[PDB]
Amino acid sequence: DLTNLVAEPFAKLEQDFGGSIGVYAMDTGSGATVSYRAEERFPLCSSFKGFLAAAVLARSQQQAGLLDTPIRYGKNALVPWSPISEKYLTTGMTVAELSAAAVQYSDNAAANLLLKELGGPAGLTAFMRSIGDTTFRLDRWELELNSAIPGDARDTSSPRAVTESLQKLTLGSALAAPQRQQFVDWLKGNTTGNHRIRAAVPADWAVGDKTGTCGVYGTANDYAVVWPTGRAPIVLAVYTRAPNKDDKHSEAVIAAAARLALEGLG
């Protein structure tokens, strides 16, 4: 199999990039995996917002009316990159709309308001422990969680823990069937990842994804569930970082790493 023939191409890719690339991909058919730096910590950046939305849905299972609960917020809630929350400043938005905004537009104000609802970064971390993720940690809010300082474990996970948690939430039994499909539909409607894992995948394969872009230390990422035509779904996570604050992230590198991960599962 091709599982142990991706290390050299990944090394070449991270050397051309000027940093570190972390990948974990899982064929849910065979159980086969592709692993490269899959147990190293990488900053989550905005990628935590997918798991934030999952945590809201998990709580909605035992709390009727959570998703339709109106959240009234002031201008003080608006932080940079809040493209949806900005437009509903005067009316407020439901828990469901904030969740959709956080997943599909990486809306920062929406993410912070939802974090408040779940008991802050500690609350989301506790949710991730409750589905058996012992790696994920969120420590800060938007936008301070984006500092992405080399060796700083704050606001990080591993590509493997991300992929495993994503599998449990989208395909396993961590969410009830309506909540599971809603999480899948939110990820499928993501607008920020067209130049990442989606660019590594045939156009007629269904894809749901959540992106992260710290804006520093060449630190960016994408995770996705992929449904190949007539085959068991594939789950994968691609995380990058670089040693200098002004190193540029690359969407093309994330796409190329996704292509290698999928080819590696051949």
JSON list of C-alpha atoms in Angstrom, two decimals, residues 4-168:
[
{"chain": "A", "resi": 4, "resn": "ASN", "atom": "CA", "xyz": [4.28, 4.75, 3.88]},
{"chain": "A", "resi": 5, "resn": "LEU", "atom": "CA", "xyz": [5.20, 6.40, 0.52]},
{"chain": "A", "resi": 6, "resn": "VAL", "atom": "CA", "xyz": [3.96, 9.95, 1.36]},
{"chain": "A", "resi": 7, "resn": "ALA", "atom": "CA", "xyz": [6.74, 10.91, 3.91]},
{"chain": "A", "resi": 8, "resn": "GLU", "atom": "CA", "xyz": [9.30, 11.92, 1.18]},
{"chain": "A", "resi": 9, "resn": "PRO", "atom": "CA", "xyz": [6.74, 13.99, -0.88]},
{"chain": "A", "resi": 10, "resn": "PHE", "atom": "CA", "xyz": [5.46, 15.67, 2.38]},
{"chain": "A", "resi": 11, "resn": "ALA", "atom": "CA", "xyz": [9.10, 16.48, 3.40]},
{"chain": "A", "resi": 12, "resn": "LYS", "atom": "CA", "xyz": [9.70, 18.00, -0.09]},
{"chain": "A", "resi": 13, "resn": "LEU", "atom": "CA", "xyz": [6.44, 20.03, 0.22]},
{"chain": "A", "resi": 14, "resn": "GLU", "atom": "CA", "xyz": [7.22, 21.41, 3.75]},
{"chain": "A", "resi": 15, "resn": "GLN", "atom": "CA", "xyz": [10.83, 22.28, 2.62]},
{"chain": "A", "resi": 16, "resn": "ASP", "atom": "CA", "xyz": [9.49, 24.23, -0.47]},
{"chain": "A", "resi": 17, "resn": "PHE", "atom": "CA", "xyz": [6.88, 25.88, 1.85]},
{"chain": "A", "resi": 18, "resn": "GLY", "atom": "CA", "xyz": [9.59, 26.81, 4.43]},
{"chain": "A", "resi": 19, "resn": "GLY", "atom": "CA", "xyz": [7.82, 25.22, 7.44]},
{"chain": "A", "resi": 20, "resn": "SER", "atom": "CA", "xyz": [6.03, 22.18, 8.94]},
{"chain": "A", "resi": 21, "resn": "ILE", "atom": "CA", "xyz": [2.98, 20.35, 7.47]},
{"chain": "A", "resi": 22, "resn": "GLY", "atom": "CA", "xyz": [0.75, 18.06, 9.56]},
{"chain": "A", "resi": 23, "resn": "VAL", "atom": "CA", "xyz": [-1.65, 15.59, 7.89]},
{"chain": "A", "resi": 24, "resn": "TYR", "atom": "CA", "xyz": [-3.97, 12.80, 9.02]},
{"chain": "A", "resi": 25, "resn": "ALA", "atom": "CA", "xyz": [-6.36, 11.08, 6.56]},
{"chain": "A", "resi": 26, "resn": "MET", "atom": "CA", "xyz": [-8.70, 8.18, 7.34]},
{"chain": "A", "resi": 27, "resn": "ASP", "atom": "CA", "xyz": [-10.47, 5.87, 4.81]},
{"chain": "A", "resi": 28, "resn": "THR", "atom": "CA", "xyz": [-13.62, 4.98, 6.85]},
{"chain": "A", "resi": 29, "resn": "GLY", "atom": "CA", "xyz": [-14.07, 1.96, 4.46]},
{"chain": "A", "resi": 30, "resn": "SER", "atom": "CA", "xyz": [-10.77, 0.09, 5.19]},
{"chain": "A", "resi": 31, "resn": "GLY", "atom": "CA", "xyz": [-9.79, 1.98, 8.42]},
{"chain": "A", "resi": 32, "resn": "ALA", "atom": "CA", "xyz": [-6.46, 2.77, 6.60]},
{"chain": "A", "resi": 33, "resn": "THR", "atom": "CA", "xyz": [-4.68, 6.05, 7.53]},
{"chain": "A", "resi": 34, "resn": "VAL", "atom": "CA", "xyz": [-2.03, 8.43, 6.13]},
{"chain": "A", "resi": 35, "resn": "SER", "atom": "CA", "xyz": [0.04, 10.10, 8.91]},
{"chain": "A", "resi": 36, "resn": "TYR", "atom": "CA", "xyz": [2.65, 12.89, 8.64]},
{"chain": "A", "resi": 37, "resn": "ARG", "atom": "CA", "xyz": [3.52, 14.87, 11.86]},
{"chain": "A", "resi": 38, "resn": "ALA", "atom": "CA", "xyz": [-0.08, 13.79, 12.70]},
{"chain": "A", "resi": 39, "resn": "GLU", "atom": "CA", "xyz": [0.58, 13.88, 16.50]},
{"chain": "A", "resi": 40, "resn": "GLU", "atom": "CA", "xyz": [2.39, 17.28, 16.55]},
{"chain": "A", "resi": 41, "resn": "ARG", "atom": "CA", "xyz": [0.45, 20.34, 17.86]},
{"chain": "A", "resi": 42, "resn": "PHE", "atom": "CA", "xyz": [-0.52, 23.03, 15.31]},
{"chain": "A", "resi": 43, "resn": "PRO", "atom": "CA", "xyz": [-2.55, 26.19, 16.05]},
{"chain": "A", "resi": 44, "resn": "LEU", "atom": "CA", "xyz": [-6.31, 25.72, 15.37]},
{"chain": "A", "resi": 45, "resn": "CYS", "atom": "CA", "xyz": [-6.78, 29.36, 14.25]},
{"chain": "A", "resi": 46, "resn": "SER", "atom": "CA", "xyz": [-10.50, 29.64, 13.10]},
{"chain": "A", "resi": 47, "resn": "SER", "atom": "CA", "xyz": [-10.70, 25.80, 12.65]},
{"chain": "A", "resi": 48, "resn": "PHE", "atom": "CA", "xyz": [-12.03, 25.49, 16.27]},
{"chain": "A", "resi": 49, "resn": "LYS", "atom": "CA", "xyz": [-15.32, 27.11, 15.03]},
{"chain": "A", "resi": 50, "resn": "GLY", "atom": "CA", "xyz": [-16.41, 23.79, 13.39]},
{"chain": "A", "resi": 51, "resn": "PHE", "atom": "CA", "xyz": [-16.10, 22.03, 16.79]},
{"chain": "A", "resi": 52, "resn": "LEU", "atom": "CA", "xyz": [-17.82, 25.06, 18.42]},
{"chain": "A", "resi": 53, "resn": "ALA", "atom": "CA", "xyz": [-20.88, 24.49, 16.15]},
{"chain": "A", "resi": 54, "resn": "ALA", "atom": "CA", "xyz": [-20.75, 20.72, 16.95]},
{"chain": "A", "resi": 55, "resn": "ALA", "atom": "CA", "xyz": [-20.81, 21.58, 20.73]},
{"chain": "A", "resi": 56, "resn": "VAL", "atom": "CA", "xyz": [-23.91, 23.80, 20.26]},
{"chain": "A", "resi": 57, "resn": "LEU", "atom": "CA", "xyz": [-25.63, 20.91, 18.34]},
{"chain": "A", "resi": 58, "resn": "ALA", "atom": "CA", "xyz": [-24.63, 18.36, 21.09]},
{"chain": "A", "resi": 59, "resn": "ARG", "atom": "CA", "xyz": [-26.25, 20.63, 23.73]},
{"chain": "A", "resi": 60, "resn": "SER", "atom": "CA", "xyz": [-29.38, 21.10, 21.47]},
{"chain": "A", "resi": 61, "resn": "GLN", "atom": "CA", "xyz": [-30.02, 17.28, 21.80]},
{"chain": "A", "resi": 62, "resn": "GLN", "atom": "CA", "xyz": [-30.95, 17.70, 25.53]},
{"chain": "A", "resi": 63, "resn": "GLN", "atom": "CA", "xyz": [-32.27, 21.35, 25.24]},
{"chain": "A", "resi": 64, "resn": "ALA", "atom": "CA", "xyz": [-35.27, 21.99, 22.91]},
{"chain": "A", "resi": 65, "resn": "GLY", "atom": "CA", "xyz": [-35.29, 25.59, 21.52]},
{"chain": "A", "resi": 66, "resn": "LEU", "atom": "CA", "xyz": [-31.49, 26.25, 21.89]},
{"chain": "A", "resi": 67, "resn": "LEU", "atom": "CA", "xyz": [-30.94, 26.71, 18.12]},
{"chain": "A", "resi": 68, "resn": "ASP", "atom": "CA", "xyz": [-33.88, 29.22, 17.81]},
{"chain": "A", "resi": 69, "resn": "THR", "atom": "CA", "xyz": [-32.81, 31.21, 20.95]},
{"chain": "A", "resi": 70, "resn": "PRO", "atom": "CA", "xyz": [-32.31, 34.88, 19.91]},
{"chain": "A", "resi": 71, "resn": "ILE", "atom": "CA", "xyz": [-28.91, 36.45, 20.88]},
{"chain": "A", "resi": 72, "resn": "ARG", "atom": "CA", "xyz": [-29.07, 40.28, 21.14]},
{"chain": "A", "resi": 73, "resn": "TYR", "atom": "CA", "xyz": [-25.51, 41.73, 20.98]},
{"chain": "A", "resi": 74, "resn": "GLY", "atom": "CA", "xyz": [-24.12, 45.31, 20.86]},
{"chain": "A", "resi": 75, "resn": "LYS", "atom": "CA", "xyz": [-21.43, 46.91, 18.61]},
{"chain": "A", "resi": 76, "resn": "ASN", "atom": "CA", "xyz": [-18.98, 45.91, 21.47]},
{"chain": "A", "resi": 77, "resn": "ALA", "atom": "CA", "xyz": [-19.35, 42.21, 20.31]},
{"chain": "A", "resi": 78, "resn": "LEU", "atom": "CA", "xyz": [-18.11, 43.05, 16.75]},
{"chain": "A", "resi": 79, "resn": "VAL", "atom": "CA", "xyz": [-14.41, 42.22, 16.18]},
{"chain": "A", "resi": 80, "resn": "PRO", "atom": "CA", "xyz": [-12.58, 42.11, 12.81]},
{"chain": "A", "resi": 81, "resn": "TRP", "atom": "CA", "xyz": [-13.90, 39.53, 10.24]},
{"chain": "A", "resi": 82, "resn": "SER", "atom": "CA", "xyz": [-17.55, 39.37, 11.41]},
{"chain": "A", "resi": 83, "resn": "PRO", "atom": "CA", "xyz": [-19.13, 39.58, 7.94]},
{"chain": "A", "resi": 84, "resn": "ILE", "atom": "CA", "xyz": [-22.55, 38.08, 8.99]},
{"chain": "A", "resi": 85, "resn": "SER", "atom": "CA", "xyz": [-22.87, 39.34, 12.64]},
{"chain": "A", "resi": 86, "resn": "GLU", "atom": "CA", "xyz": [-22.25, 42.96, 11.36]},
{"chain": "A", "resi": 87, "resn": "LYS", "atom": "CA", "xyz": [-25.45, 42.81, 9.23]},
{"chain": "A", "resi": 88, "resn": "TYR", "atom": "CA", "xyz": [-27.73, 41.71, 12.16]},
{"chain": "A", "resi": 89, "resn": "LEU", "atom": "CA", "xyz": [-26.29, 44.18, 14.74]},
{"chain": "A", "resi": 90, "resn": "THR", "atom": "CA", "xyz": [-29.70, 46.00, 15.04]},
{"chain": "A", "resi": 91, "resn": "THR", "atom": "CA", "xyz": [-31.87, 42.76, 15.13]},
{"chain": "A", "resi": 92, "resn": "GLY", "atom": "CA", "xyz": [-29.62, 40.10, 16.78]},
{"chain": "A", "resi": 93, "resn": "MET", "atom": "CA", "xyz": [-29.35, 36.45, 15.47]},
{"chain": "A", "resi": 94, "resn": "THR", "atom": "CA", "xyz": [-30.37, 32.91, 16.66]},
{"chain": "A", "resi": 95, "resn": "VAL", "atom": "CA", "xyz": [-27.82, 30.42, 18.13]},
{"chain": "A", "resi": 96, "resn": "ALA", "atom": "CA", "xyz": [-28.27, 28.46, 14.81]},
{"chain": "A", "resi": 97, "resn": "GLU", "atom": "CA", "xyz": [-27.48, 31.53, 12.61]},
{"chain": "A", "resi": 98, "resn": "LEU", "atom": "CA", "xyz": [-24.35, 32.37, 14.72]},
{"chain": "A", "resi": 99, "resn": "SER", "atom": "CA", "xyz": [-23.22, 28.68, 14.39]},
{"chain": "A", "resi": 100, "resn": "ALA", "atom": "CA", "xyz": [-23.74, 28.81, 10.56]},
{"chain": "A", "resi": 101, "resn": "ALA", "atom": "CA", "xyz": [-21.91, 32.18, 10.39]},
{"chain": "A", "resi": 102, "resn": "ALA", "atom": "CA", "xyz": [-18.99, 30.76, 12.51]},
{"chain": "A", "resi": 103, "resn": "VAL", "atom": "CA", "xyz": [-18.66, 27.63, 10.28]},
{"chain": "A", "resi": 104, "resn": "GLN", "atom": "CA", "xyz": [-19.39, 29.07, 6.78]},
{"chain": "A", "resi": 105, "resn": "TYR", "atom": "CA", "xyz": [-17.85, 32.62, 7.08]},
{"chain": "A", "resi": 106, "resn": "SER", "atom": "CA", "xyz": [-15.49, 32.12, 10.10]},
{"chain": "A", "resi": 107, "resn": "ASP", "atom": "CA", "xyz": [-17.47, 34.97, 11.76]},
{"chain": "A", "resi": 108, "resn": "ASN", "atom": "CA", "xyz": [-15.40, 36.05, 14.83]},
{"chain": "A", "resi": 109, "resn": "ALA", "atom": "CA", "xyz": [-18.18, 37.93, 16.74]},
{"chain": "A", "resi": 110, "resn": "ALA", "atom": "CA", "xyz": [-20.47, 34.89, 16.20]},
{"chain": "A", "resi": 111, "resn": "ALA", "atom": "CA", "xyz": [-17.71, 32.53, 17.49]},
{"chain": "A", "resi": 112, "resn": "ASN", "atom": "CA", "xyz": [-17.15, 34.69, 20.66]},
{"chain": "A", "resi": 113, "resn": "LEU", "atom": "CA", "xyz": [-20.94, 34.93, 21.36]},
{"chain": "A", "resi": 114, "resn": "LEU", "atom": "CA", "xyz": [-21.27, 31.10, 20.98]},
{"chain": "A", "resi": 115, "resn": "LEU", "atom": "CA", "xyz": [-18.16, 30.56, 23.17]},
{"chain": "A", "resi": 116, "resn": "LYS", "atom": "CA", "xyz": [-19.90, 32.72, 25.85]},
{"chain": "A", "resi": 117, "resn": "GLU", "atom": "CA", "xyz": [-23.02, 30.44, 25.58]},
{"chain": "A", "resi": 118, "resn": "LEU", "atom": "CA", "xyz": [-20.85, 27.27, 26.12]},
{"chain": "A", "resi": 119, "resn": "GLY", "atom": "CA", "xyz": [-18.75, 28.66, 29.04]},
{"chain": "A", "resi": 120, "resn": "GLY", "atom": "CA", "xyz": [-15.75, 30.04, 27.09]},
{"chain": "A", "resi": 121, "resn": "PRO", "atom": "CA", "xyz": [-12.71, 28.18, 25.65]},
{"chain": "A", "resi": 122, "resn": "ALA", "atom": "CA", "xyz": [-12.78, 25.89, 28.77]},
{"chain": "A", "resi": 123, "resn": "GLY", "atom": "CA", "xyz": [-16.40, 24.90, 27.91]},
{"chain": "A", "resi": 124, "resn": "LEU", "atom": "CA", "xyz": [-15.53, 23.97, 24.28]},
{"chain": "A", "resi": 125, "resn": "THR", "atom": "CA", "xyz": [-12.41, 22.07, 25.54]},
{"chain": "A", "resi": 126, "resn": "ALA", "atom": "CA", "xyz": [-14.68, 20.13, 28.01]},
{"chain": "A", "resi": 127, "resn": "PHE", "atom": "CA", "xyz": [-17.07, 19.23, 25.11]},
{"chain": "A", "resi": 128, "resn": "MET", "atom": "CA", "xyz": [-14.07, 17.87, 23.12]},
{"chain": "A", "resi": 129, "resn": "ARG", "atom": "CA", "xyz": [-12.95, 15.80, 26.20]},
{"chain": "A", "resi": 130, "resn": "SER", "atom": "CA", "xyz": [-16.57, 14.46, 26.44]},
{"chain": "A", "resi": 131, "resn": "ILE", "atom": "CA", "xyz": [-16.22, 12.86, 22.90]},
{"chain": "A", "resi": 132, "resn": "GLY", "atom": "CA", "xyz": [-12.76, 11.43, 23.87]},
{"chain": "A", "resi": 133, "resn": "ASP", "atom": "CA", "xyz": [-10.46, 14.13, 22.33]},
{"chain": "A", "resi": 134, "resn": "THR", "atom": "CA", "xyz": [-7.61, 14.53, 24.93]},
{"chain": "A", "resi": 135, "resn": "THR", "atom": "CA", "xyz": [-5.41, 16.68, 22.57]},
{"chain": "A", "resi": 136, "resn": "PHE", "atom": "CA", "xyz": [-7.69, 19.66, 21.62]},
{"chain": "A", "resi": 137, "resn": "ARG", "atom": "CA", "xyz": [-7.25, 22.78, 23.81]},
{"chain": "A", "resi": 138, "resn": "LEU", "atom": "CA", "xyz": [-8.82, 26.21, 23.34]},
{"chain": "A", "resi": 139, "resn": "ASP", "atom": "CA", "xyz": [-7.36, 28.73, 25.83]},
{"chain": "A", "resi": 140, "resn": "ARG", "atom": "CA", "xyz": [-8.29, 32.19, 24.38]},
{"chain": "A", "resi": 141, "resn": "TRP", "atom": "CA", "xyz": [-11.04, 33.94, 22.38]},
{"chain": "A", "resi": 142, "resn": "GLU", "atom": "CA", "xyz": [-11.06, 35.61, 18.95]},
{"chain": "A", "resi": 143, "resn": "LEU", "atom": "CA", "xyz": [-8.79, 37.08, 17.94]},
{"chain": "A", "resi": 144, "resn": "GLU", "atom": "CA", "xyz": [-6.02, 36.51, 20.59]},
{"chain": "A", "resi": 145, "resn": "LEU", "atom": "CA", "xyz": [-6.09, 32.71, 19.93]},
{"chain": "A", "resi": 146, "resn": "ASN", "atom": "CA", "xyz": [-4.37, 33.44, 16.52]},
{"chain": "A", "resi": 147, "resn": "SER", "atom": "CA", "xyz": [-0.85, 34.39, 17.94]},
{"chain": "A", "resi": 148, "resn": "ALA", "atom": "CA", "xyz": [0.48, 30.95, 16.71]},
{"chain": "A", "resi": 149, "resn": "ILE", "atom": "CA", "xyz": [3.84, 31.40, 18.56]},
{"chain": "A", "resi": 150, "resn": "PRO", "atom": "CA", "xyz": [6.22, 28.48, 17.85]},
{"chain": "A", "resi": 151, "resn": "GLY", "atom": "CA", "xyz": [6.18, 25.90, 20.73]},
{"chain": "A", "resi": 152, "resn": "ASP", "atom": "CA", "xyz": [3.11, 27.58, 22.40]},
{"chain": "A", "resi": 153, "resn": "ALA", "atom": "CA", "xyz": [0.53, 24.78, 23.04]},
{"chain": "A", "resi": 154, "resn": "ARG", "atom": "CA", "xyz": [-2.31, 27.35, 23.63]},
{"chain": "A", "resi": 155, "resn": "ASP", "atom": "CA", "xyz": [-5.20, 27.02, 21.11]},
{"chain": "A", "resi": 156, "resn": "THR", "atom": "CA", "xyz": [-3.76, 23.88, 19.36]},
{"chain": "A", "resi": 157, "resn": "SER", "atom": "CA", "xyz": [-4.64, 20.28, 18.44]},
{"chain": "A", "resi": 158, "resn": "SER", "atom": "CA", "xyz": [-3.00, 17.50, 16.33]},
{"chain": "A", "resi": 159, "resn": "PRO", "atom": "CA", "xyz": [-4.08, 16.66, 12.75]},
{"chain": "A", "resi": 160, "resn": "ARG", "atom": "CA", "xyz": [-4.96, 13.14, 14.07]},
{"chain": "A", "resi": 161, "resn": "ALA", "atom": "CA", "xyz": [-7.15, 14.39, 17.01]},
{"chain": "A", "resi": 162, "resn": "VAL", "atom": "CA", "xyz": [-8.89, 16.87, 14.62]},
{"chain": "A", "resi": 163, "resn": "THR", "atom": "CA", "xyz": [-9.61, 14.06, 12.07]},
{"chain": "A", "resi": 164, "resn": "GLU", "atom": "CA", "xyz": [-10.77, 11.56, 14.78]},
{"chain": "A", "resi": 165, "resn": "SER", "atom": "CA", "xyz": [-13.10, 14.16, 16.43]},
{"chain": "A", "resi": 166, "resn": "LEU", "atom": "CA", "xyz": [-14.42, 15.22, 12.98]},
{"chain": "A", "resi": 167, "resn": "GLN", "atom": "CA", "xyz": [-15.19, 11.51, 12.16]},
{"chain": "A", "resi": 168, "resn": "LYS", "atom": "CA", "xyz": [-17.08, 11.01, 15.50]}
]
